[PDB]
Structure formats: C-alpha cells, structure tokens
Ligand binder design. Structure first.
Ligand SMILES: [Mg+2]
Ligand SMILES: [Zn+2]
Lengths: 52, 136, 225, 468, 104
RNA sequence: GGGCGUGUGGCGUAGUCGAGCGCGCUCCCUUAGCAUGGGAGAGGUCUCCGGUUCGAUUCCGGACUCGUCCGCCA
RNA sequence: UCAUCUAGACAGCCGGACGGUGGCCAUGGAAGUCGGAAUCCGCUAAGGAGUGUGUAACAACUCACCGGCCGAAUGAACUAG
C-alpha cells in the first residue's frame, strides 16, 4: 500500500493515459488524435488497460 | 563450465577438442569418456569446441558398464596433459587426459578419484575437491 | 547450533573452512554472511584467520587441524606460512608435510584425542602427525572409503560417518575411536559429511540445504545443547 | 505501508501473555503486530526493521535484529525512536522470536530487550509485566549458551543485586505462571510450528524443548516463592493435570534425557512441597507415567539412558515412602515393570546406580516389595559377576566396584543366613582374585578398604605363597 | 448483515497480505476458542477464486453451506443465486416445449 | 511438405439425431472316443474436445492419429 | 446541408436541474437509469415519465435544460485541392 492520495497522484502520470491502437503511443487521456506522424495522427485510441 | 561454477577461471590452454577420449578417473565403473561438447564454448566457422582443465563437458561412455554406455552425461576435466601456463608462470602438464562424471549441478556421480587433480579444477568444483585424493 | 551458511552459493562449509576448538580458518574470497556467521557464533575468544593454502580457496580439504597443531601441505608458500604463524596463537604448532597425497583434510580425520588416516600414508607422515598433533593414529577405511576426512565428521563428543556404512564397521570404528558414531547425511542428502560441515565442542556450521532431521542428528551426536 | 485490519482479534478480547492491550502469543498464526500500530512507528527505519522480522527467512530476520541492536546501542540519538508504540510492537514480536529454532535469533532478541530495559528504565514499567516473564523463560532454557549470557545480562541490568533478581520472581509470579500455562495447555505442537515447513518430528521436538523450559521455570518459581502453591492453586492444577508435561516422560525416543530429568525434578519438588500428596489425581497420573518409563529403557538404549537411571530410582524410593508403597499399588504390573527395569539396568552400571538401588531396597524392605532371597540376591550376584568380567577396564570402575561393595555389604547384613554370608565371601574373593589391578589402583584399594576380618585376609595371602 | 461482518473480517485478514494456510489455521484456532464469526465459516476456503463458504441456519439446528464471493455484496450474491434460479426455469420451459414432439 | 479421406466393446464390424451382432472367453450343462454342442455372461468414455440441439456416433468446428496421392536440382 | 447568434451563441468556472409519480405491465427486488410498451401535465427562467455513474431496491453524484461572469461567432455531419 502506498496511500490512497499518493496512489492517485502516481496513477495520474502512470495509468490515466490513452494508447494509440496503431503505434502504441502513450497519449493524454482526453486526446482525440495521436501526436505521432508514423500513424498519420489517427483517431483510433483506447484507454490504457488498468489492473483489478 | 557455466552454471555450477564456484567463481571464475583464468584461461587455460585448450587441449581436448570434440572427439577426444579421456580416462575416467572416478570409481563409477566407466573406463573412458568421449567428449562431444564443451559448456560455454563460443562459435567460429570450422573451429572445434575444445576443453581445458576444470571445464565441464558433455560426454558419452564409450567403454565401461552398459547402464553408463549409450547416453550423454556431464563430465568435468581433472587432468589435461597439454602444457598450460599459470600466472606464476610455471608450465605444467599431467601425463594423461582424465575426467569424472557429474550432474549438471556439478556433484560427482562417483565417490573417489584416482590420481592427481589440478588446483584450477579443485578450486572451481568443491565436490571434486572433496572426493579428490591429491590436489596439485 | 548447526548454523546455516553458504560459501557464495556453496553448501559445503568443510571444504572452505577448518574449525577447531582453539582457532578457525576461513577462505579469503568469502561473503559477508559467511564471515558474520563465524564472527557472531565464535565470538572474540577464538581467533578467525582469513587464509589461503597453496594458492587455493579450499583450505579445509588441504589442511588437517588440531587444538595442539596444524598441518599444511608442501605447496603452501612462505608468505602464507608466516601469516598463519603471526595470526595463530603461540600454543599451536604449524609444520609443513612432505607427502604425496598432499590434501590433508581429505586424508586425515582427526580430533583432540584420536585420529583416522588414509591407509596408504607414509610412516614419516604418521610419526609427524603423532608428534605435532600429539594424537594416536589408526589406518582405517570407512566401509571402503579411503578418504576418511571427507567421509567422516569427528569431534570429541561424537562422530557422524558415511550413510552407506556397514553396522559392523560402525561398532568397530566406535570402539576404536571411543566415541559414539551415527550414519547420516548432510546438505539435503549429500554423502560427503566431512566436506559438508565443520564441528567442534560447541559449534557446528553446515549448509543451508541441510534439513531439520539432519540438523537434529548433528546436534544429537555432537551434544551441542 | 502497512495495510489491513485484525477484525477477528477484536471479538476475542484475550491478550494471552500481554497485559497492555496487545495479544502476545507463541503461536505463529496470531499475535502478529496490528497493521495500524506498525504505521504509527516514529521512523521509517523502524518500520522496515519490522517488515524484515516478519519475513520467514532467517538471514533476513537476523540482519534486521542486527540493525535494531545498532539503533539501540546508539540510544541517545535514537531515544525518540523507541516509544510506547515500539515497545508494544516489540513485545508481540519478541514472543515469537524467543521460540525460534535459530539460537542467534533467540540470543539477540534477549539481548535487545535487556538493553531496552536498561536504557529506558522507569519508562518500561508499563511493559515490564509483558517483558519480564519472557526474559526469564530465556534464562531458564535448557541450552547453556542462551541461558548463561541472558542471566548475566539481566543481573547486570539490575546492577548486580541478587535481591532484585529474586524479587522479580516474586513480583511477577502470577504472570510467570500464566506463561507456563499457555505453553503447556493452550499450545500444541502444531500451533507452535508451521506444518508445511516442518515434519511430524521436529515439530514435536520443538514443542518439547519449549515445554521443558516452562517446567524448569516452574521449578524455579516454586523454589523462589514459598507461598506460590496456596495463592495460585487453581492455575497450578490446570497446568499439572494436562498430560503434556507428563508426555515428556518418554525414553523410547528423543535426543536427550535432560528434558526427562527436568520432569523428574518437578515431581520430586512437588512431593517435597506436598502438592502431589495433597492432590491425588495429579500424583497418580505422574506415578503411572513414571512406571511406564521404566519399561521404555531397553538394551538398545541402555547406553543413552544410563545417566538418568540413578535419578529415576531415587525418586521412586521417595515416592514409595508416601502411602506405604502406595505408588506400587496404583499399577497392577508395577512390580513386573520394576523387575524388568532392574534386569536391564544391571547390565550397564553408571556412577551412583547402586546407591539408588539400595535406597529403593531400604524403602521396600519394611513392606516386603522384593523377596530378599529368591528375588534380590540373584540380582546382586549377577551384578558382581558382570562387574568383574568387564573389570577394571573402564575408567571410574574403581568407584563403581567400591559402591557395589559398600551397598552389597549393607544388604548382606540384613540376612542372618548362611547362603548370603557364603556368597559374600566367595564373591569378594573372586572379585579381588580375578580382579585386574585392584591393588595397583591405590584409590580403588582405599575406597574398597576391606571386606572381612584382618587376620583371615592374611591367611589367604599365606595360601598364595604356599600354592604350587 | 452478519455475512457482511464475516466478509469484512476475511477481507481485513486478506489485506494484511497474510498467507492463506495461516489464515485457515487462524480460523481453526478461533473456532476452538469460540469466536462466532470464525464458527460461521467452513474451512476448505476457495481464496483462489475469491470465494468463501458460510453456514446459515435453515430454521430461525440444521445448517446449510452457501458460497459467497468476496468481491460482491451479500445481496449481490443473493441476486446471483436468484439468477441461477431464473435461468433454470427457462430451460425447463424449453424441455416442456420439447416433450411432445420428442416423445412422438 | 502439402492435399484427400479415416477412426465403435478384449477382437472384428453395423449405425437415417432417439450403440447392435459375431468372435475371443465368463460360467454351467452336454458326450463310448477320433469333444463337441446348448443356455444364460461381461464388454464401449462411438479418437478426443467444444458448440447447435432437447439429445448428437449420428450435425458441425478444432485438434489428434492412420492410410492414400503428388511433389528438389543439374 | 442542417442548426444556434449582441433579445448574449460555443469553451471555462458557479448555482438550480423540481412536483403529480414509487406514471402502466413485469420481477424476490427494480422508485429516470434489468426489460416491454406508452411518454402526459403542473410550476416554470428551466428541468427527460431520463445522459451516465450508481444501490438488493433505495439513497447519492452527474448530465441536457435554464440562469450570473465572458461579449461574438460557434457546433455537428459530409465533399474535394
Ligand atoms: Mg566446415
Ligand atoms: Zn499513433
């Protein structure tokens, strides 16, 4: 156990992201398009897979 | 060698390539060991994997007891007979090639060793040093 | 205590260490836990010497030790001999042995009073053992095992011998040594008991894989309680 | 950092050894420090030390103890670290640690607690009730190495005052008894040691070692406190009634007779106090078990059990006196057991064995337990014959033979019969004549001062010179 | 509510990262010492599938053994048992539709 | 290597989605032999595993296994 | 091509987001939120017989709607260089 607030603060940077389906890039959670050129700024995004 | 090494070993001049037949020094009922592989040997085109003293090899019993023949088992080289240099610079050699049988962890299948063993092998394998009569 | 110790992963402590009542010898290339076991259990009353014998980390199989004396092979250098002479107390006598078998821990199984040797040792070496150690000597094999030092663990209180030993050989050796002997295993069934562990009057040190019934047999036969 | 709640414990409300609101218990499963308290510790360093102590591996536990000791040694810098919270947690862990298989763990834990008491004196008062019984149990542990240092340290802690050490026994006696009860009655071999990591044996061995310490403590408590029996009778009865103390009286198996000896001492002490006479059931249970033990001794284990035999006989003689040999009456086959025991025992003689045998005879003669002629004499004669053949090959033989003669001579005196007199003379002559080197051992000759009138011995010397 | 107390107790022991066999030994010892929360439990614990089993009185002396998931509420476990009841009824209706044409 | 088919009792072999016979031998009776015959026996996870069904040897998918057929260069 | 727009639009904060009514069937329960149908009034500046989270069912939170600050364009879908 870390602490509940400290787990929230660490998960803000480590777990509450989104993943581009084409190029696996770690993206902002409210993003609409990937920031990478190689996937062509696609809008195929998924949430980052949580535990539990 | 590899897994069951107790420490490292300085480079000893390689004297036993693949296909070499050495005497079987222990009392396990085998007479000779035929080397088919050397543990930890590298890869080069046309180069035979060769063994030195203290090395662990894969070997078959060509002559001996029928429950020891016709299968592969690990072995440890204890006498080399090709002259090698120590860091105190003596060049030394035995008069025959000799090894003992072991498992992959290094403990001996047999119980006693006839003839001398090298200190570079006795330091690296404690079971060989345990069952060894004389260490030079 | 039979103290669980490893020599960097090695569960054979008798190979890398030699323990008597008066002194202890440990290899120079040892871990902090391995040194800390002897330092905590032995205390400051008994000197612990970090030593190398004949350029080898193995010292227990190379040397045979007693409270009165220590025997070293011919290949032991003058620097190691002088370091042992300075580090050891004045009571013990250190003498080089010039003998072909040359691995005195494997050859000789000895305690304070009585000793078992390899049958084929030289007579000058037998007289040298009787002189320096002050110990009466018998040439005997333990059920056909010529390496009595590797295949027996001996102290003043009792002795542990090889597991595959004839019972008749057990009472014969027990009557010859005037101590009770038990056939048993050490280090999860390893046959080499003398290489497996070291023991004296109040301490036994063994490998970590030595199981609880084996440790109970050790403390029972050596009366360490 | 530490998570979870001990909800089950809250319902129970039994603090076991502890009196400060935390359950302290020997068993592995419970008495573990509560997670919330663990978080409350003053420093992170302390918390890590606690997690390591919890881990099973010994090297890890030992390293943590070494660290804790270092912190305590630098007490002035770290005084803030050790608070009531630390002490409550330590108390729960200390209990588990003292039962540890590894001696180093046991010794270090004891040393640490003593240091805490010395350093935090007068602030550990609240916790003295929890700590003191455990510390004492360690000082009364069979192994000399754990016990001697611990006692020396305790004495030093109390400024080398004998009175303080004795006072401790008196002040916390009720608590000391509670600890004994907990080991004897509440615990079982399984509870003390985890089954998965131990065999059926070893678990038994461990329990027995711990229980032996409890008995030794009980004997000490009784000696120190004269009025203990009256004040704590109910508690004493429950501890005594349970068979666990008595199960220790088995010589068929087990590494040492030291534990068995401790039980014998307890029975003797109880008899001297009169508790055993006062409570019949406890006495009968103890007596029957002692009789069973006599059967256990066998030819195979005679060498191992020989030191304890003089003690066993001596206790029996004392018990026989009670109730006119009532002890024999309890068991129908007791006489047979005794006869068997004697036959096995005679073959191997240990110092003091003969005196015990005579003592038994002295108590039994008034009530005719053994026929003097049909039964006893054969025992005596065979014994001398055996003694002579293996004579004087062993060391203390001189003492053993001397004893036989002194004892036999007394036995013979109460005969008024020719056969006994004849046997004495013949045996004496044989013992001296085949002998070994009886004259040569001056002490042996001195100890065996004489067996007959002076002039006759001279006549026999005369025959030897006169002989062919 | 008492099932929720038992669940909170077992989950509090789980959240201490305690070994499962030591938890079962703690349940046995507290049953011997007469703790009601321990005595409501059945000892072959399915902690590998996060499931416990609990003894409930049939009449408000016979007891029934019911399996409770630790990750759902007691009412939610009751709704699962109701759901297994409801699924069984539909199969029975399918059997009743089957019977006539099958036996013909 | 691929394609195509295949698989049932201890053995052989029949089955439309609603496991049977023979043989071997389990027993008993039968008999002038150059020893038969009669009556009752047991026996399958239908190669296996899923799904559909209400039920699949019976339908289907996958895997396994065996048999076939066709395949490299100068 | 649809919509909104100085009579205050879209983002961002803040407040309300209600009664008839736990609307009718159906369920051991399901009260806006397991489903089947209907989907209407009042008070309104405004609030769906409910957009989600949500409980055994509740409770609770949030929505799309209206309001203060902002003062001017913005949202959705689609087409092709
Ligand atoms: Mg080539
Ligand atoms: Zn991308």
């Amino acid at each position: 156990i870390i602490e509940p607030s400290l787990k929230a603060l660490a998960s803000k940077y480590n777990c509450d992201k989104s993943v581009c389906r084409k190029c696996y890039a770690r993206l902002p959670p409210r993003a609409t398009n990937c920031r990478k050129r190689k996937c062509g700024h696609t809008n195929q995004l998924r949430p980052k897979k949580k535990l539990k | 060698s590899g897994n069951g090494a107790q420490g490292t070993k300085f480079r000893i001049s390689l004297g036993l390539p693949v296909g070499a037949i050495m005497n079987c020094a222990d009392n396990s009922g085998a007479r000779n060991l035929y080397i088919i592989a050397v543990k930890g040997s590298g890869s080069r085109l046309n180069r035979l994997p060769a063994a030195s003293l203290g090395d662990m090899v894969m070997a078959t019993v060509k002559k001996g007891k029928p429950e020891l023949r016709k299968k592969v088992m690990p072995a440890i080289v204890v006498r080399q007979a090709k002259s090698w240099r120590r860091r105190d610079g003596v060049f030394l050699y035995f008069e025959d090639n000799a090894g003992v049988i072991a498992n992959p962890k290094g403990e001996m299948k047999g119980s006693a060793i006839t003839g001398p063993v090298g200190k570079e092998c006795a330091d690296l394998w404690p079971r060989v040093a345990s069952n060894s009569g004389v260490v030079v | 205590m039979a103290t669980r110790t490893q020599f960097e992963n090695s569960n054979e402590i008798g190979v890398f260490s030699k323990l008597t009542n008066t002194y202890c010898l440990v290899a120079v290339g040892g871990s902090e836990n391995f040194y800390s076991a002897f330092e905590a259990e032995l205390g400051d009353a008994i000197p612990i010497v970090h030593t190398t014998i004949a350029g080898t980390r193995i010292i227990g199989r190379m040397t045979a030790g007693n409270r009165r004396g220590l025997l070293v092979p011919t290949q032991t250098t003058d620097q190691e001999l002088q370091h042992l002479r300075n580090s050891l107390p004045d009571s013990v006598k250190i003498q080089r042995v010039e003998e072909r078998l040359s691995a005195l821990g494997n050859v000789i199984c000895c305690n304070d009073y009585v000793a078992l040797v390899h049958p084929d040792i030289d007579r000058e070496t037998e007289e040298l053992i009787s002189d320096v150690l002050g110990v009466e000597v018998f040439r005997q094999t333990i059920s056909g095992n010529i390496l009595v030092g590797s295949y027996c663990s001996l102290s003043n209180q009792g002795g542990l011998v090889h597991p595959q030993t004839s019972v008749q050989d057990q009472e014969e050796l027990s009557s010859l040594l005037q101590v009770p002997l038990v056939a048993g295993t050490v280090n999860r069934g390893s046959s080499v008991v003398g290489a497996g562990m070291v023991v004296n009057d109040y301490l036994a040190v063994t490998g970590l894989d030595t199981t609880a019934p084996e440790l109970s047999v050790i403390e029972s036969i050596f009366r360490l309680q | 950092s530490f998570g979870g709640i001990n909800t089950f414990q809250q319902y129970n409300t039994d603090l076991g050894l502890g009196h400060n609101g935390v359950r302290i218990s020997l068993n592995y499963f419970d008495g573990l420090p509560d997670p919330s308290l663990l978080n409350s510790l003053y420093s992170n360093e302390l918390k890590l030390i606690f997690k390591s102590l919890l881990k099973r591996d010994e090297t890890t536990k030992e390293k943590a103890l070494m660290d804790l000791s270092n912190l305590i040694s630098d007490f002035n810098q770290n005084e803030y670290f050790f608070n009531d919270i630390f002490l409550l947690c330590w108390s729960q862990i200390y209990a588990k640690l003292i039962i540890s298989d590894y001696k180093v763990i046991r010794l270090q834990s004891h040393q640490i607690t003593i240091m805490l008491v010395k350093s935090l004196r007068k602030k550990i008062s609240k916790f003295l009730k929890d700590f003191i019984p455990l510390i004492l149990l360690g000082t009364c542990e069979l192994d000399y190495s754990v016990s001697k240092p611990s006692l020396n340290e305790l004495t030093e802690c109390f400024n080398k005052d004998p009175a303080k050490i004795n006072a401790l026994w008196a002040v916390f006696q009720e608590q000391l008894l509670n600890l004994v009860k907990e080991i004897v009655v509440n615990e079982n071999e399984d509870t003390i040691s985890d089954e998965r990591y131990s065999s059926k044996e070893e678990s038994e061995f461990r329990y027995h070692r711990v229980i032996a310490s409890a008995v030794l403590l009980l004997i000490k408590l009784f000696v120190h406190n004269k009025d203990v029996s009256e004040r704590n009778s109910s508690s004493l009865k429950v501890i005594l009634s349970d068979e666990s103390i008595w199960k220790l009286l088995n010589l068929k198996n087990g590494q040492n007779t030291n534990a068995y000896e401790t039980v014998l001492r307890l029975i003797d002490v109880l008899y001297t106090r009169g508790y055993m006479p006062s409570h019949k059931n406890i006495m009968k249970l103890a007596v029957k078990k002692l009789l069973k033990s006599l059967t256990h001794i066998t030819s195979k284990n005679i060498l191992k059990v020989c030191p304890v035999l003089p003690s066993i006989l001596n206790l029996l003689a004392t018990l026989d006196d009670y109730e006119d040999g009532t002890i024999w009456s309890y068991d129908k086959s007791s006489k047979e057991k005794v006869l068997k025991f004697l036959s096995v025992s005679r073959t191997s003689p240990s110092p003091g064995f003969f005196n015990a045998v005579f003592a038994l005879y002295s108590s039994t003669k008034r009530h005719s337990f053994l026929d003097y002629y049909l039964e006893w004499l054969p025992f005596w004669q065979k014994s001398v014959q055996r003694l002579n053949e293996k004579g004087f090959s062993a060391r203390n033989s001189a003492e053993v033979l001397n004893e036989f003669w002194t004892n036999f001579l007394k036995f013979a005196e109460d005969s008024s019969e020719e056969r006994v007199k004849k046997m004495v003379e013949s045996e004496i002559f044989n013992s001296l004549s085949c002998g070994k080197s009886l004259s040569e051992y001056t002490k042996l000759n001195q100890t065996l001062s004489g067996v007959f009138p002076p002039d006759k011995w001279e006549r026999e010397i005369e025959d030897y010179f006169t002989s062919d | 509510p008492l099932i929720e107390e038992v669940k909170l107790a077992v989950q509090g022991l789980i959240d201490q990262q305690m070994d499962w066999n030591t938890i079962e030994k703690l349940i046995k010892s507290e049953q011997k010492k007469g703790n009601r929360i321990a005595q409501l439990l059945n000892l072959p614990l399915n902690l590998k599938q996060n499931k416990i089993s609990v003894k409930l009185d049939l009449s408000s002396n016979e007891k029934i053994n019911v399996t409770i998931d630790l990750g759902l509420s007691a009412y939610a476990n009751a709704t699962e048992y109701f759901n297994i009841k409801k699924t069984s009824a539909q199969k029975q209706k399918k059997v009743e539709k089957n019977v006539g044409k099958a036996m013909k």
